[PDB]
Amino acid sequence: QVGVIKPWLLLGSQDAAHDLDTLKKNKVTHILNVAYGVENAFLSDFTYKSISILDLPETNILSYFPECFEFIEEAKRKDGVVLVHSNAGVSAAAAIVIGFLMNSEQTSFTSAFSLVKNARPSICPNSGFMEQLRTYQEGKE
Amino acid sequence: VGVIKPWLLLGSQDAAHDLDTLKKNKVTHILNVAYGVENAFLSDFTYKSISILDLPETNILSYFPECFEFIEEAKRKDGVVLVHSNAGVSAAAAIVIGFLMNSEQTSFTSAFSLVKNARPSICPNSGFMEQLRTYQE
């Protein structure tokens, strides 16, 4: 299962990452895998990047922005389509997508959150991720 | 937090760390199937932890003896158990679905529906769904 945030920006679970037919139907070109233990199943069909982002409040989600956002922008620059996925893809993967929208569109946490939540209503970033994103633009700590 | 029964609750790591809500809901027992979530309130609740990776290769059925024994103990003592994982959407949900099937002889579809109505964000992975579909067939 897949949220279409933009036509080129998708958010989903590990099951999305392993559903070839739907990856093709959505014209996926790039897959950002922030899960644990999820094999990149289709090496010949997609450009993959992995980065471990554990679903804990202690994870520093902001730390991952340079690497993750460069990849997303790579997909976009090439007029492709990137799927960001994790295990359940409701928390860490959601937070990366929210942050990306915040930075790429210079939009607020609440605006970006709303865009993701409408596209994938099962999102529920952990409290630490919410605090980290809510106070990123203001520069807390 | 999803209220599956007044004594069976399903939630996230944030529910496990919210003492005020835990006490409002009369929790007594916490079954922690998360990774990396400290059992914060040892003097207030009875905790049991079990590692359950959210991967389709995980054998969810293997965890049922340990998990269900604990849930049954909370129930026998007229307490209230919170089952939680990290997001509370996949393995913790699978445990709750399986528990209704096992304790109540409920069908998979009915049990799944009960859990999904109490917590619409649930989505056990493809492996867990197939394991639960054929459980007690």
UniProtKB/Swiss-Prot annotation, chain B:
A Gene Ontology term for the protein's cellular component: cytoplasm
Cleaved signal peptide residues: none
Active site location: S85
Reaction(s) catalysed (UniProt annotation): O-phospho-L-tyrosyl-[protein] + H2O = L-tyrosyl-[protein] + phosphate; O-phospho-L-seryl-[protein] + H2O = L-seryl-[protein] + phosphate; O-phospho-L-threonyl-[protein] + H2O = L-threonyl-[protein] + phosphate
Keyword annotations: Acetylation, Hydrolase, Protein phosphatase
GO BP annotations, alphabetical order: negative regulation of JNK cascade; positive regulation of JNK cascade; positive regulation of MAPK cascade; regulation of JNK cascade
Expression across tissues: Expressed in the heart, lung, liver, and pancreas. The expression level in the pancreas is the highest.
MF terms in GO: JUN kinase phosphatase activity; MAP-kinase scaffold activity; mitogen-activated protein kinase kinase kinase binding; protein kinase activator activity; protein kinase inhibitor activity; protein serine/threonine phosphatase activity; protein tyrosine phosphatase activity; protein tyrosine/serine/threonine phosphatase activity
Regulation of this protein's activity per its record: Phosphatase activity is enhanced by Ca(2+) and Mn(2+).
EC top class named in words: hydrolase
EC annotation from Swiss-Prot or TrEMBL: 3.1.3.16, 3.1.3.48
Ranges for domain Tyrosine-protein phosphatase: 1-137
Function in brief: Has a dual specificity toward Ser/Thr and Tyr-containing proteins.
Family indicated by similarity: Belongs to the protein-tyrosine phosphatase family. Non-receptor class dual specificity subfamily.
Name this polypeptide is given: Dual specificity protein phosphatase 19
Taxonomy of the source species: Eukaryota, Metazoa, Chordata, Craniata, Vertebrata
Encoding gene per record: DUSP19
